[PDB]
Design a binder for these strands. Structure first.
Length: 292
DNA sequence: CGTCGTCAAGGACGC
DNA sequence: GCGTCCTTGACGACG
């Protein structure tokens, strides 16, 4: 057993002055603005991925802002054709250099909504995520939360299932779900996976905060079963003494050992404000453990 | 250049 | 009913 764990971080790299998560405001919407910001995000993303490889960070969560406002209903810009060259170039690199990709389209995606409008708009946002990834000629996972709780859980869960079951292939095939710190725990997520085949992503912090008494190694074991290929997870840490769920501004290098050491054969996304810096710490610990 | 009013969006919460 | 906080607070008009 050589490698088997990848490390990633999210959206952009601060230590590089090359923002890849620039968006724009509806008042600016036009073909020119969209292309300009889309090109600069993508030029930076190439760079960010070149730097990641250089520093043995082969996992990355792509910003949803990459093509700003792409899902907005007033948005009608043919970014797929215009930007096809860069987009292909970034994908070829991702695949040539064995990089894992994910996206996390945000909180406005409630696929189990009671309001149809929000379902349809949720699907458009997912559509953009899938379109982006195809445009790079890559697979990738799109992670989301189960969504709302209205009318209690098992209706909510079924609203999720019924809707999931209706999505187009090339969204559903990328879709994985994450456990949260309020409503839907892992046990719930598994409930869904069992009925859907949806891969579950374990967010460690949301789980130590909302569990049914599953120990880390028990929880992992069950999730693993929901993945065809190699599981992803989200690793975050608490910000000391806050109303729990607040992401630490960086990772504690010891907490990370304790954790990564009861685990192999997964890729880890780091959810912390200082982004690449924690990625570097994460790369140290694993290099040390021969698990990178 | 620097300041700061405003930002597409759902849903849950505390007031 | 309104303000707040949620992958990463930052866009961009105005002087």
């Amino acid at each position: 057993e050589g490698r088997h764990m990848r490390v990633g971080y999210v959206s952009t790299n601060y230590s590089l002055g090359c923002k890849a998560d620039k968006t724009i405001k509806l008042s600016s919407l036009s073909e020119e603005r969209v292309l300009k910001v889309s090109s600069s995000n993508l030029l930076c993303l190439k760079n960010i991925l070149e730097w990641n490889l250089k520093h043995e960070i082969l996992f990355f969560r792509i910003s949803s802002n990459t093509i700003p406002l792409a899902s907005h209903p007033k948005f009608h810009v043919n970014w797929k054709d215009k930007l096809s060259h860069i987009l292909g170039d970034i994908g070829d690199f991702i695949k040539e250099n064995s990089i894992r990709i994910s996206m996390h389209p945000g909180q406005y995606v409630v696929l189990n909504s009671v309001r149809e409008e929000v379902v349809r708009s949720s699907i458009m946002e997912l559509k953009y995520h899938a379109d982006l990834l195809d445009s790079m000629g890559i697979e990738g996972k799109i992670q989301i939360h189960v969504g709302s709780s209205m009318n209690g859980k098992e209706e909510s869960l079924n609203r999720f299932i019924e809707n999931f079951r209706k999505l187009p292939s090339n969204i559903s095939k990328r879709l994985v779900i994450e456990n949260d710190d309020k409503v839907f725990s892992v046990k719930d997520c598994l409930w869904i996976s069992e009925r859907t085949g949806i891969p579950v992503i374990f967010d460690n912090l949301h789980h130590s905060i909302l569990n049914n008494g599953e120990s880390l190694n028990d929880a992992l074991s069950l999730v693993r079963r929901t993945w065809k290929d190699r599981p992803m997870i989200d690793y975050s840490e608490q910000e000391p003494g806050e109303k729990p769920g607040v992401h630490a501004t960086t990772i504690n290098e010891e907490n990370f050992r304790r954790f990564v050491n009861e685990v192999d054969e997964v890729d880890i996304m780091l959810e912390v404000k200082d982004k690449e810096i924690s990625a570097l710490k994460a790369v140290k610990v694993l290099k040390e453990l021969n698990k990178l």
